[PDB]
Amino acid sequence: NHIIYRSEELLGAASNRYNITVRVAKRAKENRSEDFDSIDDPNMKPAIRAIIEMSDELT
Amino acid sequence: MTFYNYTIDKGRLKKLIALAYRRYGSARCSQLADELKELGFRF
Amino acid sequence: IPPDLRPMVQLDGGRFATSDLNDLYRRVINRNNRLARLQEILAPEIIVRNEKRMLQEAVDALIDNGRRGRTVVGANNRALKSLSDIIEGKQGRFRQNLLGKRVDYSGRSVIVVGPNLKIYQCGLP
């Protein structure tokens, strides 16, 4: 339930709701390409981790 | 906060949801509607 | 038109399934070859004149059936679908295959109520 709070605080503080979506998708693609090894966890998807990291840099 | 010492109908619930979508956001508003949903079902 | 856009497939049972564009092209080619045959052997002008009018009506039915004269029909008096009929309507190319499509990775089922289940969550079988 924290990921919808982070998504709401990431959308509310963005200058454009359509540019922040493309930036989250680009960071999620980088997170998926950098974690290409199989040592991972199913509860932390690349898009969820990108939203978490971008909300943590947002503060 | 506001106490609301009266009888609750559909329009006043809509007013409360519209007020919660002014200072809290979408997710807290949906959580409030979820709690009001389960309270109304129980009673 | 290319032949894979007017396909001729065979059904299980031996019967062939054809498209209506092949009959119109067949009429155009038949009347064209008969007109060349009549002009070769110097037929009278009342016969060559009726053959040119029939070729004229054959090209018009291929492009837009029933636009000018009698509508060319098929087996059960159903009108043949033409080059403008495959694009011009709500069953044409635009409204049935370009602005809306059937998609992969999809399904459907009946819906039931979901109490004791949150918002942003659906119960998927």
Report the run of H or E that residue C17 belongs to, with start and end: strand C16-17
- The chain A residue lying nearest B31, using CA atoms, is A1
Contact C39, C33 (CB under 8 A): no
B-chain CB neighbours of A5 within 8 Å are 27
**Exposure string over B19-43, b if 16+ CB within 10 A, otherwise e:** ebeeeebebebbbbeeeeeeeeeee
- For residues C10 and A19, give the distance between their C-alpha atoms in angstroms, rounded to a whole number: 52
**Method for this entry:** cryo-EM
Quoted resolution (Å) = 3.0
Contact B17, A4 (CB under 8 A): no
B-chain CB neighbours of C120 within 8 Å are 30
Closest CA to C82 of C98, C99, C66: C66
